[PDB]
């Protein structure tokens, strides 16, 4: 039992508004960052039960994210807003508790569609 907590990390100032207001709605706690290392920083005092992060910036596109999120976070739920590139570190990522990969649509229906679901297939 929690009180939903959901992460994201694209834009920040545009795809927080929406998703911070939207996802409230639902009764879940959703914050955002730069971009996923920052969420790499203060997941370090607190784990979110359903993360996103994008993949354009890190060594490795963005995939580097989840790279670095599975070596503090045991089994993170992270989703990614896009897969272009370095797709190895993808499916890496589902091994180490990553939820799917995403395209770049995310504003609310396509984001919370499927954060809902996420979640839905986690708690029984
Ligand atoms: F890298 Be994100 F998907 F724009």
């Known amino acids: 039992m929690q009180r939903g907590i959901v992460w994201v990390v694209d834009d920040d100032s545009s795809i927080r508004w929406v998703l911070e207001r939207a996802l409230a709605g639902a009764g879940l706690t959703c914050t955002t960052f730069e971009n996923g290392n920052?969420?790499?920083?203060?997941?370090?005092?607190?784990?979110?039960?359903?993360?996103?992060?994008?993949?354009?910036?890190?060594?490795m596109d963005g995939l580097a994210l989840l790279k670095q999120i599975k070596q503090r976070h045991p089994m993170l739920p992270v989703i990614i807003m896009t897969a272009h590139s370095d797709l190895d570190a993808a499916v890496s990522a589902y091994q180490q508790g990553a939820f799917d990969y995403l395209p770049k649509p995310f504003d609310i229906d396509e984001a919370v569609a499927l954060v809902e679901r996420a979640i839905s297939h986690y708690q029984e």
């Open 38 to 59: 920052e969420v790499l920083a203060a997941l370090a005092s607190k784990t979110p039960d359903v993360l996103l992060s994008d993949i354009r910036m890190p060594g």
